């Protein structure tokens, strides 16, 4: 949106915003896949519930990706065109499943959530009072990432508590 | 409903019925909150399932409250106007969460269900063959309280059984 | 959410935020019940409409409570565990029905609303630019409380206006 | 249902039950029409709400009629085949609109309701513990008639209360 | 609708129109009940289908009644306030079930449909080009009565044809 | 639709029809806004119901506009392209809210309705037996305008009747 | 539900109630299958309608089974674990299709309905005023069995009447 | 519908009406297929939109066919029993696709719409004020044919305008 | 689909496949109309049910036609562009209604079903293991034609069985 | 479907196919009940999830039974008319619940799944390329039985993995 | 909302806010009509798509109008009561269709979107941190205006690109 | 599914099948992203339609990935756990957008479709008659890839045909 960008360029560094958004975009796709494949391999304590959350969270990150990519286009930017570039652009590094047990996978995904939380706070901070539209997108995604963290932490807490309780 | 009450006053003590209903109403609001907050804090074995039941049961007690309150109005009564009075009127005492583990919360809520079962049997007994409408309301709620008890007991049974099984 | 709270503790007093949220939570449950019982007893001018709003508003405060409680949990807090504590924590005092006429009940609920608006403006102000997520929750609830106020005021206005109109 | 009736004839006077049901059926159709035409002509205080209830109640009596008629067939009876007979069979007399104001129409329908409540209490009492199926039908209808009474009384109460309130 | 009626009074005899509509209304209620009770007692050939049509047709006549009554009100008329008057006002006489077999009931209802068809043609003729709104209502109902006739005739045709075929 | 218009030009003055439709279109947009803003400001007797009708009627006039505009396009016409022209083209004059009480607003909208009824009767008369499609559109809109009139009159009747009833 | 049963044991013989429920349960499964397979093989007069009812009734008995089994569990009982036992426990004997014509199948299913009607009247009688919850279940099922009887009898009546009519 | 036809025979030539309806019916089936196969082969400018309209219009003509055929039956007529006869009865001649480009197909279908428009105006004229029911059917179909014409003309207009614009 | 066809041309005679599909297409349109007009004129035993099936089957053949036509396009073929050609291409000959009784119409439609069955067995045989996609289409349609045959045969069986039973 | 069967009798032994289908049918009813009663009594580790699967799988086997029975009818066969015969015909023996813990019940149902898997592989092999319709039914059911096996194995895997993890 | 406004008057100039909102309201109604009539007359390149967007955007501006008007009322203001005043109050001038081609109409509407974007940024800036509720409304509308701009620009881009590509 | 795999290992090389599936899985994710980002950047002729297809096809490939991954798990395999490996495993190479015009993007996606087509023909061939379940998955995906190819080719055909037509 050329006229909108023209107006926004007066208030903040749009070019930098686009770079941050493409880093975010790369991170969303990685977090998406990480959950998706995690769902496919998770085993053990509370598996059906944890698998279910991973599936749900995969779908939520995918939607995040779309919100971000659509906004990049509105800012006259180009979203990352090649998945090979995700790894360069991402600050949050892809955390591949090795151990398939639920605690291991829950811990990996919690770290990625923390890094997601850090990204959208930055973008919200960067755009607050300047790019109202991008700011609200970041805040929306942020709220969901905090919920994701909480959801995963609850399972970790429950499994830890079960373990104690059984001794 | 003045004409209805006129007819019913010939068959039973409506004034006493209203008092019983207001004690029941008080109890429903307490049971409602108890489940609601219990859902918010429950941790441990089978948490997602137990939390889910607490949420569902919270909503079911709320609906019980409406059935009772609406009927009080039809009996030309006034429902309890102030939550401060719930504690005076209730026979079932509010059972505050202290321990957040699922067995603790399950046991507390099972106690409340037993108390609710006693209430609606009384009201059903009091109204059977006399106030058909209020009787059917009591029986309806009763059936749901018995199901609630069963639901909670099943988790207690499952967690006890897991514990054995793991040794 | 431990990592989220860790980050937020650098920007604001989360402990204080939780206390404000638990006061808000207490207030929501009281406002909820107030509307719910009000709906059950309201009589007089425009009763069906006013009763309807009370029922709708009861459900809306009920949802506010959930938004607040869920967020308390995310801030590593514990929501108020006992209704007996609502009265201590609440700044907005429960306003029990005495008169059952619609103007009386409307006026009571308008006060409760104005007090709610003040609560969420405070929380919004406290969290603005710092806890984006909690701030948006407060702003969301706030927007609804302002609508509730407007809804109730409209009935007061209409009834007052009818009264005038009928003398002539 | 021949085998079901055979069994029930050992427990109660089914022939009498059928007669009571056909009197009830007649009454439902009259109550149905009364509400339906009442809705069409009602004017004055709280008209839109009162008209709405009349329309809703018309539909609810209509459904009562079906419950009753279906059960008559199950008891090997024949439902009243001619509307001309409704008036003979009905204990509740059709209460034709004369005054179209809402209080007048509300009062007429409240009488019809009270008469309906009496009918279903009788049928419930007659069948209690004996014809479980018919009893539950009567109790179901009864619960609705009590609600109808309450709904109508509320408007009477509100209008009376408005009237007072406006003098001052 | 006072202003609408004022305009229409210049084009046709509204008072007469209202009388015709009230005769139609009376007839709809009778036809409604006739189908309703017919459905309750029908037996024999193609009973489930014939019963089903009677039920459907009952509901369709009921809706006709509402269309007519609502329009009477808009013409500043009063719809018939007492069912006792239906029999006076109706041209189509109520045709009570005596024989419960489907051919008997089908023939009775076909007669009623013929009578209904005559009514709405009259009203359509009376209002054509003058009271556009009432005319379209009459035509709408007419189309449905013609369909009702067809529906009933088809069963008569099918049962007659079965009879032949089986000899 | 060129071929359709070609055929219709043999039966009636299509150019004149289009002008009538554009006057109607202008009137719909004015009636639409009138109801829409009326809904926003109405106060007093039966306000919630009256406001509700205004909102519903606003949406119904909005749909009338679309039916008319679409048909203009089918008649190879151009709908009015500038709201500034509505006022010139409209026979029904925009009736701005001054008094916000429900009787005042009801009376204003009843006039607008009566004027709408006249418009569609004209168009129906103009097209009857000649432009079947446009005629049915006018008749459809007409039937709705008559209902709108009735709806509004009912409230006037009810409020007048309440007023009487309350003196005694 | 242990607390509920404790309360009920004071009012009636729960053990006996459970045995009656398991006999009922066995009967429901047999009635279910009987309708299900009857639907699959029915031929002749009004076949499509009769087949349709059999299909519907099969589904209704299956739901009855669930209501009964769920309540058995709530009464601290164990539902019949093995279909081989159905035949021992059932009073209503499975009535296998031999003749596939609709009258034959209708008669068989009517007899099973009669026996179903007898069962739930007994259970209703046994539990009336004592086990409100189980009583309402029995009454609910009873109402449906009476409807089933009526539905089947109507076809028998129609076919008989067709037969006459065609001579 | 025998009684309805009896009444209508007094007002117009029903036999002739039926012949006109069967010509219309034949035309609808041809127009239906023409659109259907046109959709399957269309190529070029605005293809996806034009294909979509052809698909939609095919479905609309099919519904027209049903309205007409159902009414023929109500008029005691027999609808054309054999597709071989469509070509004899149709005034609108089937216009087979030769050129598959959108302008060619749009022009062919516009001509068929014009001929459809002519048919229903005739039938409306023939039945106006006499057979209210058949008249309303013709008018309903007519309105849709005029819309079809408009829809197709719009594409022709757009493509012509694009062509200019690009030079 | 040019690349797909290129691959398929190595495995089978695509040109012949297209011809078989166009013959099938022609046959579907004829079977479609046959059922559609049959529904409009059927009379007699079990008419409502038989009419209903004809209506349902009409719709099912019409969907078959779409599956076949779409696939022809994917095989780079052209579907039959003119209904006049249906009769040349079809092996299954159009079986026009003469007698309107249900047995006559049922018998005619059964023959056409058998003919459809032969067609899709052929096409399934022709494409099995070679054109997986077209094979699955043919098998899908085949399964529905077998069901159609069964549906129709059931009515013939029922009517024959009624006839006996009534003597 | 007589004509379809006539054609199929040339390609395979239909009589044998019917016997295999009736054995499968018997097996589906047993597997259906097994899951259904298993759901009612299951206790312990992951109970809510395991109970849920048993309920879902009960419903899926019940649908399998319908697919098989319907096809038997189409092959001019008669489905097993008496549940007493299920035990004779079934290869998969009914595996009655003894121990109510989830591992025990999971193991029992896994064995029955394997047995269902064998059955549909056989029937698919028997009919492949010959009875396309029955083959696709067998393959459809097969795919679901493989999924069932996977579902159940997952829980066994999770519970085994929890056990380890807790020591 | 008197108490709300009382509070807000301490934080900002509400009177000025209301004037800005009424200017915005005026502008929304003009933008609404502009799109609405534009949709009615648009011709040429990508017409169906562009027409569709105009229709969608018309509906979106209408909704904007309601959000604004409702908020004016809550701020104890009066929304503009007469459309004649829209032109005085609006900063964005109504841009009447002259040329009906899609590029012309797209350019006109893009201008209007730019003007709308300026308005809601102003209102957002004016209310940020002070009137949270009105601010969020402005931001919400802003986000949609930026999307509208993007949507329109994409068509301009596509049509320009087509033009090049075709030479 | 251990028992299922045991049976399948007798009929084919499951280990090889898993490798082929993981290559397919990798390919689906790449084709998914390719379409997704292509939708985001496409410009020019028929953009809205082409963009829409890319969006739809993105979603369809994403579902393909799930079908394949789920089946890998059932074959006791592990799906590719890291997106970095997609590029190694994929035969179909990721075809990054360079030119954003619709013809360029359409051509790129057509090539990838052909490559998907080859893959599922291979897997269908590999598993035909041996792994019925995996074969049907491959055939299902295959049918969709053929449709995708057709969809894309249609646009190329239309745009080429427009170009000619405009000169
Ligand atoms: Fe994310
Ligand atoms: Fe996340
Ligand atoms: Fe409760
Ligand atoms: Fe409870
Ligand atoms: Fe609140
Ligand atoms: Fe509030
Ligand atoms: Fe009643
Ligand atoms: Fe009543
Ligand atoms: Fe009628
Ligand atoms: Fe009729
Ligand atoms: Fe209008
Ligand atoms: Fe109007
Ligand atoms: Fe049963
Ligand atoms: Fe039964
Ligand atoms: Fe047509
Ligand atoms: Fe057409
Ligand atoms: Fe077919
Ligand atoms: Fe077929
Ligand atoms: Fe199975
Ligand atoms: Fe299985
Ligand atoms: Fe806007
Ligand atoms: Fe905009
Ligand atoms: Fe794919
Ligand atoms: Fe693809
Ligand atoms: Mg989650
Ligand atoms: Mg529960
Ligand atoms: Mg409200
Ligand atoms: Mg009511
Ligand atoms: Mg009918
Ligand atoms: Mg209205
Ligand atoms: Mg039944
Ligand atoms: Mg169209
Ligand atoms: Mg069929
Ligand atoms: Mg499963
Ligand atoms: Mg848009
Ligand atoms: Mg596609």
- Rounded Cα distance between K145 and G148, Å, is 62
G89, with CB counted inside 10 A (0-12, 13-18, 19+), is: middle
User: Which residues in chain B have their CB less than 8 angstroms from residue A157's CB?
Assistant: 43
Over G78-133, what HEC string results? CCCCCHHHHHHHCCCCCCCCCCCEHHHHHHHHHHHHHHHHHHHHHHHHHHCCCCHH
Identify whether the C-beta of residue G157 lies closer than 8 Å to the C-beta of residue G50.
no
CA G48 to chain centre: 22
Instruction: Show which subunits contact H, needing at least 3 CB pairs below 8 angstroms.
Output: E, F, I, K, L
- Rounded Cα distance between E95 and E107, Å, is 10
Torsion of CA I33, I39, I43, I46, to 10 degrees: 130
State the helix-helix crossing angle for D102-127 and D14-41, rounded to 10 degrees. Answer: 170
Chain C contact present for F48, CB below 8 A: yes
In terms of DSSP H, where are the helices of chain B?
2-9, 14-41, 47-74, 86-89, 102-127, 132-165
Residue of I nearest to J128 (CA): I128
- Rounded Cα distance between K33 and K17, Å, is 24
- Structural tokens at position K7: 């509070």
User: Which residues in chain F have their CB less than 8 angstroms from residue H143's CB?
Assistant: 132-133, 136
User: Which residues in chain L have their CB less than 8 angstroms from residue H50's CB?
Assistant: none
State the helix-helix crossing angle for E47-74 and E102-127, rounded to 10 degrees. Answer: 20
Q: Specify the 3-state DSSP secondary structure of A8.
A: helix
Q: Specify the 3-state DSSP secondary structure of F101.
A: strand
- Rounded Cα distance between H85 and A48, Å, is 64
- Dihedral sign (CA F146, F150, F152, F153): positive
F127 alpha carbon to ligand 16 midpoint, in Å? 22
The closest of F94, F113, F128, F124 to F20, measured between CA atoms, is: F124
Biggest alpha carbon–alpha carbon distance for chain F: 68
The closest of G77, J48, J108, J55 to B162, measured between CA atoms, is: J48
Q: Specify the 3-state DSSP secondary structure of L46.
A: coil
Tell me which DSSP letter residue E85 carries. G
Interchain proximity C139–K129, CB inside 8 Å: no
What residues contact F92, with CB distance under 8 A and at least 6 apart? F27, F30, F31, F112, F115, F116, F119
L86-115: b (≥16 Cβ within 10 Å) or e:
beeebebebbebeebbbbbbbebbbebbbb
H2, with CB counted inside 10 A (0-12, 13-18, 19+), is: middle
- Rounded Cα distance between D65 and L162, Å, is 67
Identify whether the C-beta of residue J112 lies closer than 8 Å to the C-beta of residue J31.
yes
Gyration radius from chain G CA atoms: 18
E93 alpha carbon to ligand 9 midpoint, in Å? 13
Tell me which DSSP letter residue I94 carries. P
Interchain proximity F94–K80, CB inside 8 Å: no
- Rounded Cα distance between D86 and H74, Å, is 37
Torsion of CA F153, F156, F160, F166, to 10 degrees: 120
**What's the gap in Å between the CA of I45 and the closest CA on chain E?**
5
Task: Pick B157's closest partner by Cβ from J43, J163, J166.
Answer: J43
> Does the annotation place H61 within a ligand binding site?
yes
- Rounded Cα distance between J84 and I63, Å, is 43
- Rounded Cα distance between F160 and F162, Å, is 6
DSSP string, L67-107: HHHHHHHHTT------GGGHHHH-SSPP----S-BHHHHHH
Q: What angle do CA I142, I145, I150 make, to 5 degrees?
A: 130
**Structure-token match 């009004």, residue found:** G46
Residue of L nearest to J141 (CA): L133
| Backbone dihedral angles phi then psi of residue G43, each to the nearest 5 degrees | -145, 155
Half-sphere exposure of H113 (CA within 13 A, CB side): 27
G16, with CB counted inside 10 A (0-12, 13-18, 19+), is: exposed
- Rounded Cα distance between C8 and C14, Å, is 7
- Rounded Cα distance between J110 and L3, Å, is 9
Gyration radius from chain E CA atoms: 18
Residues with CB under 5 A from ligand 4 (ion): B 113, 116, 145, 148
- Rounded Cα distance between D164 and C106, Å, is 18
Biggest alpha carbon–alpha carbon distance for chain C: 68
| Residues in chain G, total | 167
DSSP string, I37-90: HHHHH-BSTTHHHHHHHHHHHHHHHHHHHHHHHHHHHHTT------GGGHHHH-
- Structural tokens at position G136: 């309402």
C and E: touch, per 3+ CB pairs < 8 A? no
Identify whether the C-beta of residue I96 lies closer than 8 Å to the C-beta of residue I72.
no
User: Which residues in chain G have their CB less than 8 angstroms from residue B157's CB?
Assistant: none
Task: Pick L1's closest partner by Cβ from J121, J128, J149.
Answer: J149
Mutate to test the interface with I, among G47, G162, G167 (most CBs of I within 10 A): G47
Instruction: Show which subunits contact L, needing at least 3 CB pairs below 8 angstroms.
Output: A, H, I, J, K
Tell me which DSSP letter residue F44 carries. S
Instruction: For L1-167, give the CATH class.
Output: mainly alpha
Q: Specify the 3-state DSSP secondary structure of F131.
A: coil
Identify whether the C-beta of residue B120 lies closer than 8 Å to the C-beta of residue B139.
yes
In terms of DSSP H, where are the helices of F100-131?
102-127
Identify whether the C-beta of residue C44 lies closer than 8 Å to the C-beta of residue D158.
yes
State the helix-helix crossing angle for J132-165 and L132-165, rounded to 10 degrees. Answer: 110
Identify whether the C-beta of residue J25 lies closer than 8 Å to the C-beta of residue J79.
yes
Residue of E nearest to G49 (CA): E48
Identify whether the C-beta of residue C80 lies closer than 8 Å to the C-beta of residue C86.
yes
Bridge partners of residue F101, in order along the sequence:
F43
F98, with CB counted inside 10 A (0-12, 13-18, 19+), is: exposed
Interchain proximity D3–G117, CB inside 8 Å: yes
| Backbone dihedral angles phi then psi of residue H118, each to the nearest 5 degrees | -60, -45
**What's the gap in Å between the CA of H11 and the closest CA on chain F?**
17
- Rounded Cα distance between H125 and E159, Å, is 38
The number of beta carbons lying within 10 Å of the beta carbon of residue A18 is 19
Resolution as reported, in Å = 2.3
Helix-strand-coil split of chain I, %, nearest 5: 80, 0, 20
Q: How far is CA G119 from CA C83, F137, G25, I111, in A?
A: 48, 63, 11, 50
Q: What angle do CA D97, D99, D101 make, to 5 degrees?
A: 110
Tell me which DSSP letter residue E101 carries. B
| Backbone dihedral angles phi then psi of residue A99, each to the nearest 5 degrees | -75, 135
DSSP string, B44-63: STTHHHHHHHHHHHHHHHHH
Mutate to test the interface with H, among L161, L164, L167 (most CBs of H within 10 A): L161
Interchain proximity F132–H117, CB inside 8 Å: no
Chain C contact present for K73, CB below 8 A: yes
What residues contact A100, with CB distance under 8 A and at least 6 apart? A41, A42, A43, A44
Question: Where exactly are the structural domains of chain F?
Answer: 1-168
Q: How far is CA F30 from CA F27, F113, I89, in A?
A: 5, 12, 61
Please give the sequence-ordered ranges of beta strands (E in DSSP) within chain D, or none if there are none.
Answer: none
In terms of DSSP H, where are the helices of chain F?
2-9, 14-41, 47-74, 86-89, 102-127, 132-165
* CA terminus-to-terminus distance, chain L: 62
Q: Specify the 3-state DSSP secondary structure of D77.
A: coil
Task: Pick L166's closest partner by Cβ from H47, H48, H166.
Answer: H166
- Rounded Cα distance between C5 and B163, Å, is 34
E and K: touch, per 3+ CB pairs < 8 A? no
Torsion of CA I18, I24, I26, I32, to 10 degrees: -150
Q: Is B38 left (phi over 0), alpha (psi -120 to 50) or beta?
A: alpha
The closest of J30, J98, J34 to J68, measured between CA atoms, is: J30
- Rounded Cα distance between I141 and C80, Å, is 63
The closest of C8, F163, D65 to A124, measured between CA atoms, is: C8
User: Which residues in chain L have their CB less than 8 angstroms from residue H167's CB?
Assistant: 166
Q: How far is CA K110 from CA E10, K48, K145, in A?
A: 53, 18, 10
CA I16 to chain centre: 19
- Structural tokens at position J98: 């003894």
Gyration radius from chain F CA atoms: 18
**Structure-token match 């039945």, residue found:** H127
The closest of G85, G92, G134, G135 to G113, measured between CA atoms, is: G92
Identify whether the C-beta of residue B141 lies closer than 8 Å to the C-beta of residue B70.
no
Task: Pick E3's closest partner by Cβ from F114, F142, F147.
Answer: F114
Considering the four listed CATH numbers 3.40.50.2300, 1.20.1260.10, 3.40.50.10880, 3.30.1490.100, the one that applies to the domain covering D1-168 is 1.20.1260.10
Q: How was this structure determined?
A: X-ray
- Structural tokens at position E9: 């009074």
- Structural tokens at position C41: 């007893």
What residues contact G163, with CB distance under 8 A and at least 6 apart? I165, I166
D57-75: b (≥16 Cβ within 10 Å) or e:
bbebbbebbebbbebbbbb
- Rounded Cα distance between D124 and D128, Å, is 6
The number of beta carbons lying within 10 Å of the beta carbon of residue A146 is 28
The closest of C128, C133, C11 to C72, measured between CA atoms, is: C133
**What's the gap in Å between the CA of G3 and the closest CA on chain B?**
6
What residues contact G52, with CB distance under 8 A and at least 6 apart? none
Gyration radius from chain B CA atoms: 18
Q: What angle do CA C70, C71, C77 make, to 5 degrees?
A: 95
- Rounded Cα distance between F159 and I138, Å, is 71
State the helix-helix crossing angle for H102-127 and H14-41, rounded to 10 degrees. Answer: 170
K161, with CB counted inside 10 A (0-12, 13-18, 19+), is: middle
- Rounded Cα distance between K24 and K37, Å, is 20
Interchain proximity G162–I165, CB inside 8 Å: no
């Amino acid at each position: 949106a050329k006229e909108s960008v023209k107006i926004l360029q007066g208030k903040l560094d749009v070019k930098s915003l686009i770079d941050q958004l493409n880093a975010a975009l790369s991170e969303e796709w990685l977090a998406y896949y990480q959950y998706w494949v995690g769902a496919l391999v998770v085993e053990g304590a509370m598996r059906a519930d944890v698998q279910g959350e991973f599936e749900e969270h995969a779908e939520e990150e995918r939607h995040h990706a779309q919100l971000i990519a659509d906004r990049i286009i509105e800012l006259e930017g180009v979203p990352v065109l090649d998945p090979k570039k995700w790894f360069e652009l991402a600050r949050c590094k892809y955390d591949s499943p090795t151990a398939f047990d639920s605690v291991s996978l829950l811990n990996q995904n919690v770290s990625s959530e923390r890094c997601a939380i850090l990204r959208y706070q930055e973008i919200a901070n960067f755009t607050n009072g300047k790019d109202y539209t991008t700011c609200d997108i970041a805040k929306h995604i942020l709220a969901e990432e905090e919920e994701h963290e909480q959801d995963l932490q609850d399972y970790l807490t429950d499994i830890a508590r079960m373990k104690e309780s059984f001794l």
